[PDB]
Design an enzyme around this catalytic site. Structure first.
Site, PDB file in Angstrom:
ATOM      1  N   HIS C  43       0.813  -1.219   0.000  1.00  0.00           N
ATOM      2  CA  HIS C  43       0.000   0.000   0.000  1.00  0.00           C
ATOM      3  C   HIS C  43       0.846   1.268   0.000  1.00  0.00           C
ATOM      4  CE1 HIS C  43       0.412   0.250   4.469  1.00  0.00           C
ATOM      5  NE2 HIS C  43       0.281   1.543   4.224  1.00  0.00           N
ATOM      6  N   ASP C  99      -0.169  -7.592   2.018  1.00  0.00           N
ATOM      7  CA  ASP C  99       0.307  -6.216   1.871  1.00  0.00           C
ATOM      8  C   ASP C  99       1.831  -6.228   1.917  1.00  0.00           C
ATOM      9  OD1 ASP C  99       0.472  -3.470   1.741  1.00  0.00           O
ATOM     10  OD2 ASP C  99      -0.240  -3.139   3.803  1.00  0.00           O
ATOM     11  N   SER C 198       3.869   3.108   7.912  1.00  0.00           N
ATOM     12  CA  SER C 198       3.563   2.107   6.890  1.00  0.00           C
ATOM     13  C   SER C 198       4.817   1.559   6.245  1.00  0.00           C
ATOM     14  CB  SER C 198       2.735   2.755   5.771  1.00  0.00           C
ATOM     15  OG  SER C 198       1.398   3.006   6.142  1.00  0.00           O
TER      16      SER C 198
HETATM   17  N1  LIG Z   1      -2.375   2.562  14.381  1.00  0.00           N
HETATM   18  C1  LIG Z   1      -2.228   1.417  13.517  1.00  0.00           C
HETATM   19  C2  LIG Z   1      -2.002   1.762  12.072  1.00  0.00           C
HETATM   20  C3  LIG Z   1      -0.990   1.119  11.384  1.00  0.00           C
HETATM   21  C4  LIG Z   1      -0.694   1.453  10.076  1.00  0.00           C
HETATM   22  C5  LIG Z   1      -1.412   2.430   9.409  1.00  0.00           C
HETATM   23  C6  LIG Z   1      -1.107   2.753   7.967  1.00  0.00           C
HETATM   24  N2  LIG Z   1      -1.991   2.049   7.044  1.00  0.00           N
HETATM   25  C7  LIG Z   1      -3.067   2.629   6.512  1.00  0.00           C
HETATM   26  O1  LIG Z   1      -3.374   3.809   6.722  1.00  0.00           O
HETATM   27  C8  LIG Z   1      -3.904   1.764   5.573  1.00  0.00           C
HETATM   28  C9  LIG Z   1      -3.674   2.173   4.112  1.00  0.00           C
HETATM   29  C10 LIG Z   1      -5.050   2.066   3.455  1.00  0.00           C
HETATM   30  C11 LIG Z   1      -6.020   2.451   4.551  1.00  0.00           C
HETATM   31  N3  LIG Z   1      -5.339   2.005   5.779  1.00  0.00           N
HETATM   32  C12 LIG Z   1      -5.842   1.824   7.013  1.00  0.00           C
HETATM   33  O2  LIG Z   1      -5.146   1.415   7.937  1.00  0.00           O
HETATM   34  C13 LIG Z   1      -7.341   2.129   7.253  1.00  0.00           C
HETATM   35  N4  LIG Z   1      -7.404   2.999   8.446  1.00  0.00           N
HETATM   36  C14 LIG Z   1      -8.150   0.842   7.470  1.00  0.00           C
HETATM   37  C15 LIG Z   1      -8.179  -0.048   6.254  1.00  0.00           C
HETATM   38  C16 LIG Z   1      -8.800   0.373   5.084  1.00  0.00           C
HETATM   39  C17 LIG Z   1      -8.824  -0.441   3.964  1.00  0.00           C
HETATM   40  C18 LIG Z   1      -8.224  -1.681   3.995  1.00  0.00           C
HETATM   41  C19 LIG Z   1      -7.603  -2.111   5.152  1.00  0.00           C
HETATM   42  C20 LIG Z   1      -7.583  -1.300   6.275  1.00  0.00           C
HETATM   43  C21 LIG Z   1      -2.442   3.056  10.088  1.00  0.00           C
HETATM   44  C22 LIG Z   1      -2.735   2.724  11.399  1.00  0.00           C
END
Ligand SMILES: NCc1ccc(CNC(=O)[C@@H]2CCCN2C(=O)[C@H](N)Cc2ccccc2)cc1
Ligand SMILES: *[C@@H]1O[C@H](CO)[C@@H](O)[C@H](O)[C@H]1NC(C)=O
Ligand code: NA
Ligand code: NA
EC number: 3.4.21.5
Lengths: 11, 28, 251
Positions: C43, C99, C198
């Site tokens: 991602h 991912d 990320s």
């Molecule tokens: N604090 C832990 C954390 C760890 C790591 C992150 C960074 N990851 C994201 O931002 C991903 C990218 C796409 C969107 N994301 C998300 O997490 C979304 N809130 C939820 C989601 C949406 C679609 C598919 C799967 C999950 C954020 C929070």
């Protein structure tokens, strides 16, 4: 923000 | 590779970092 | 990283910063797994819901860094990308299943006190260490709070969580290609990855051979450091056959 990096890395 | 996961400034010198012990203590 | 601390110098020499060329900005974390290969989250490179689809020429990797924003002359090394490889079954449409992505560098990076690869787990190290309560370590330059940004690389140690607790914490569908980590509300202690972390590594130090292994990749979550929520990490061992296939074929 970010310190400029050397121009060589930007092609 | 053969030397992976051994940090020059820690494992390679037999120095520990300030919190790695917390990890070891959790491996029960 | 929320509720972490400043890294020690050389504490995470496999840390990699994914850096956008124009505008010059941090994109993601990543990790060094050999002199030519960097591991990250898919991602970080491809996420169509947000119009994200980077090509090799859009990006640089910066290795050996400690300061977030400084150009760390004589310490960090900046590499161009030869090729990006995204898992062919990466699920950006639903839940970020699988991912994982690899980046091949144009030229090998020279190892130093600050630049050194992490190991990838074998089946037995994964079976031994991926247990509820066992702690790993997450590092990154991402946000310090959900709603700012650090001067230097941040580090937090977090326990792996029982799979039913992970599942019961969210409505998003969890798969065997993921695990979750973080403290429970009743455990008092805090900490989490956050946006900008990320793609960075979740590592564990094997007590059997005293080497660091990358067991996870920062993948997803809901908020940062919320009570009752946990960070989700790509299960590196479960996807290792793909990693090996890519490296063997290309490299
Ligand atoms: N604090 C832990 C954390 C760890 C790591 C992150 C960074 N990851 C994201 O931002 C991903 C990218 C796409 C969107 N994301 C998300 O997490 C979304 N809130 C939820 C989601 C949406 C679609 C598919 C799967 C999950 C954020 C929070
Ligand atoms: C991402 O961009 C490339 C062009 O570089 C394109 O070939 C590919 O289909 C795109 N992927 C998605 C999922 O849109
Ligand atoms: Na031993
Ligand atoms: Na939490």
């Amino acid at each position: 923000d970010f310190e400029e990096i050397p121009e060589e890395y930007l092609q | 590779e053969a030397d992976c996961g051994l940090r020059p400034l820690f494992e390679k010198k037999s120095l520990e970092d300030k919190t790695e012990r917390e990890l070891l203590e959790s491996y029960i | 990283i929320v509720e972490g601390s400043d890294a020690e110098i050389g504490m995470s020499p496999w840390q990699v910063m994914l850096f956008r060329k124009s505008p010059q900005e941090l994109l993601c974390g990543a990790s060094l797994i050999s002199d030519r290969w960097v591991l990250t989250a898919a991602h970080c490179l491809l996420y169509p819901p947000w119009d994200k689809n980077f090509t090799e020429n859009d990006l640089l990797v910066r290795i050996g860094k400690h300061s977030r924003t400084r150009y760390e002359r004589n310490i960090e090394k900046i590499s161009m990308l030869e090729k990006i490889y995204i898992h062919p079954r990466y699920n950006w449409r639903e839940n970020l299943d699988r991912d994982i992505a690899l980046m091949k560098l144009k030229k090998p990076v020279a190892f130093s006190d600050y630049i050194h690869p992490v190991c990838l787990p074998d089946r037995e190290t994964a079976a031994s260490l991926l247990q509820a309560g066992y702690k790993g370590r997450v590092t990154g330059w991402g946000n310090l709070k959900e709603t700012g940004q650090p001067s230097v690389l941040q580090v937090v140690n977090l326990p792996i969580v029982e799979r039913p607790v992970c599942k019961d914490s969210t409505r998003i569908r969890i798969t065997d290609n993921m695990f979750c980590a973080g403290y429970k509300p009743d455990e008092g202690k805090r900490g989490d990855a956050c946006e900008g972390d990320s793609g960075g590594p979740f590592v564990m130090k094997s007590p059997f051979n005293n080497r660091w292994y990358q067991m996870g990749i920062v993948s997803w979550g809901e908020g940062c450091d919320r009570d009752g929520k946990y960070g989700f990490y790509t299960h590196v061992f479960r996807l290792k056959k793909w990693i090996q296939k890519v490296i063997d074929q290309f490299g």
